């Protein structure tokens, strides 16, 4: 009864559907969105890279960001070109998994990313956190906030400052509508850097047993079912 | 209440959104759809061919099989839902299209550049109806055809240039420059598509299957159909 | 009975023959017609494509217009009623067709030579029907589509290769090589056409005129129909 | 009084020095750090890649894992803190880099030499901010992005070439030639880097976690960032 899209703020909803039914479409892609679970990373990248329309010419760092082509199911397309003739292949996370080729390039399958290492560093505290609670609370987080099944958070390590979350999802084990670790990860990263994609609960508090857990560095490593070809 | 997309049957809805909210998406395209007005031709062409996901007793049309309509094809649509100016389907064959999606140029290679999406501004729909003992009154035809675009196809009555009528063969002119298209005016390309799809009994409306098309009580059954598209820029062949 | 051609409505019958005999000629072709079985597609296309003359009020579409003719055209038909292997419309542009009449070669000039009438031996009819609450009993469906082509379109059961079924989309495979078609075996390409025309509500039968198309009582309404044509020799493009 | 390195949080202090003297050192490099001005970019990359000494429950990213950013790496930094003009990471893969860190030549082998540290004299900072009902006033924005670089990133005014503003977009240009960079003048490369890290929520300053960016009171959040580096010598690809 309120034309909002909680799970994806990168969208335009307006109650112009039959009877006031809230219609809501993805920003940049134009695709339909499901405001009950996570939106695919590919369509969220399409939003980031809207590209409405002064110039320069240089060398450039972009953080690996670009406007991808996403299939009807909203995942990445195996082949991915951004400039005119530079093309390559990507994994389910849409990172480059080959040497940039030419417009003839042949990518034959979307190689699944099945393991993701999230290494977080946290603002050191006088008293480090209880491993038990830190684990318990990170597992809750992925379960409740990112709607990821507990069976896909493989492990949660904890030493002084650096924290690590391992995610495992083979293709053999992802069923209908299971949220992808690819996307759970991305929602986490956005949250961590304070750009939460959630339209209404915006903000990652992330406090363990009351004490807040500020994160200072974040690195994410994608392991694919097939090793890249460089 | 009930998940319907009454302006585009070629969709998939369900009450699976926030607090039961009816979500609904475009078959094949996977794109978002406005269930309160017409859907862009492109989003509907994508839905037509549509490659069912797991065929699973089914068979796929052969590499060498061919259909009655050369021009039929699975297009690529931009985020606004209109045809991308350039349309490659074959491995290394590209072309440019107009706003209505038909081919404007000689087929090409993957280096091709289509600079703008040339606008189709005039459309000519050339129906022929299975004869009755006589003809009808042109008056009643113009009235009815203009009423259909006006109510059913939600096309502002200013964009029906003319209706012509002779022994049997009927004609409907549509005119819409890009200057005269306001916010959310339905396109004539879209209205025309909906019309033909209905004329040929693959209606895209929820409750309907075809076009009734009765004039002053007498039903009007349509044997032939021809739809000529005129572009602002003439096609380079 | 009465001067009626039950298998082809696109005709004029009158009892102007010897001793009030019923003579009946085919509209647009002028060809004879066998009112006991299906007429050839080529002759039915000719009927649809009359294109009457003298065009008083009607507008001539454009010099610079693109055509959406659904592949339809006025074909030339050999004295037996099959498609001429060489087809040229509107003048001076030609191509070769197959037994079903679709283009099989790149368009050509008035020197083009079409060796033979390459046969269409496999027809895939992909249907899609109005989703019900559930599905139908596959058995009953396959039984009723087999019965339909057998009784209605007078096609021999041995030519309906398969009948597949899933959620909504329904497929019907027909296979008739040249090596296996006898004298007065109705063609698959013709039964196909008769099917499509009935599917899209423009029945060709003079006196039934209705595809009830119900399976175990529940009616089967068809939302989308694609027909794929596989030739005994691949096309040359 | 309190062991704190406000200008670089990626370090380790302690009062283990002469008479309790606070001693502090950059993570991952073990280099000395000026806790009053910016630390060099090279020294920061080094600390991003720290790989803590013994994991000892932790795991190490595989030899095959990749990251989002192909140009993140662990650089070698000269004893002054700037990048070594030649960088290998792989077993047998070396290239050359600019004053800011990015590969400016083809990827060579272990007998590849690089014969100067090619300066980066002009940087383009492109930012897109999250939409608001309307724009800002270009007089306020420039008044602040110049005040921000001035005080926080401790960069001398005369090096902010320009501040632009288009539809959401904010161009910031930075110029610093070798001939204008005096001693203890913070490099632009190291102000540009500190900026992005704040823009993108990995701020390097002790107190802060991100960048507040309130122009006249309205907070400026930033969905997209693009940074373009121009080198005095053009890159030999």
Swiss-Prot record, chain A:
Post-translational note: The N-terminus is blocked.
Highest taxon, organism lineage: Eukaryota
Record membrane topology: Single-pass type I membrane protein
Tissue localization of expression: Placenta, pancreatic carcinoma cell lines.
GO biological process entries: negative regulation of branching involved in ureteric bud morphogenesis; negative regulation of cell motility; negative regulation of epithelial cell migration; negative regulation of ruffle assembly; negative regulation of stress fiber assembly; negative regulation of substrate adhesion-dependent cell spreading; positive regulation of stem cell differentiation; regulation of epithelial cell proliferation
Record's keyword annotation contains Glycoprotein: yes
GO CC, alphabetical: basal plasma membrane; cytosol; extracellular exosome; extracellular space; lateral plasma membrane; membrane; nucleus
Sequence ranges assigned to domain Thyroglobulin type-1 in this UniProt record: 39-107
Glycosylation sites: 2, 82, 130, 170
Protein name per its UniProtKB record: Tumor-associated calcium signal transducer 2
Curated annotation (Swiss-Prot), chains B, C, D:
Name the record gives this protein: Tumor-associated calcium signal transducer 2
Modification after translation: The N-terminus is blocked.
Subcellular location: Membrane
Keyword set, alphabetical order: Amyloid, Amyloidosis, Corneal dystrophy, Disulfide bond, Glycoprotein, Membrane, Sensory transduction, Signal, Transmembrane, Transmembrane helix, Tumor antigen, Vision
Glycosylated sites: 2, 89, 137, 177
From-to range in the entire protein, with total length: 32 to 268 of 323
Predominant subcellular localization, coarse grouping: membrane
Tissue specificity field: Placenta, pancreatic carcinoma cell lines.
Name of the coding gene: TACSTD2
Domain of life, source organism: Eukaryota
Disease connection: Corneal dystrophy, gelatinous drop-like: A form of lattice corneal dystrophy, a class of inherited stromal amyloidoses characterized by pathognomonic branching lattice figures in the cornea. GDLD is an autosomal recessive disorder characterized by severe corneal amyloidosis leading to blindness. Clinical manifestations, which appear in the first decade of life, include blurred vision, photophobia, and foreign-body sensation. By the third decade, raised, yellowish-gray, gelatinous masses severely impair visual acuity.
Domain spans labelled Thyroglobulin type-1: 39-114
């Amino acid at each position: 009864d309120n034309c909002t899209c909680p799970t994806n703020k990168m969208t335009v909803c307006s109650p112009d559907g039959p009877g006031g039914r809230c219609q809501c479409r993805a920003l940049g892609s134009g695709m339909a969105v499901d405001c009950s679970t996570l939106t695919s990373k590919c369509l969220l990248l399409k939003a980031r890279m809207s590209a409405p329309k002064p110039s320069e010419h240089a060398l450039v760092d972009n953080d690996g960001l670009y406007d991808p082509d996403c299939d009807p199911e909203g995942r990445f397309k195996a082949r991915q070109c951004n400039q005119t003739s530079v093309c390559w292949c990507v994994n389910s996370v849409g990172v480059r998994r080959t040497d940039k080729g030419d417009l003839s390039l042949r990518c034959d399958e979307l190689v699944r990313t099945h393991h993701i290492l999230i290494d977080l560093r946290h603002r050191p505290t006088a008293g480090a956190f209880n491993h038990s609670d830190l684990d318990a609370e990170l597992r809750r987080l992925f379960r409740e906030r990112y709607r990821l099944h507990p069976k896909f958070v493989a492990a949660v390590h904890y030493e002084q400052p650096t924290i690590q979350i391992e995610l495992r999802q083979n293709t053999s084990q992802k069923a209908a509508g299971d949220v992808d670790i690819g996307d759970a990860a991305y929602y986490f990263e956005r949250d961590i850097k304070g750009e939460s994609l959630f339209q209404g609960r915006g903000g990652l508090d992330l406090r363990v047993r009351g004490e807040p857990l500020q994160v200072e560095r974040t690195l994410i490593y994608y392991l694919d079912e097939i090793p890249p070809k460089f």
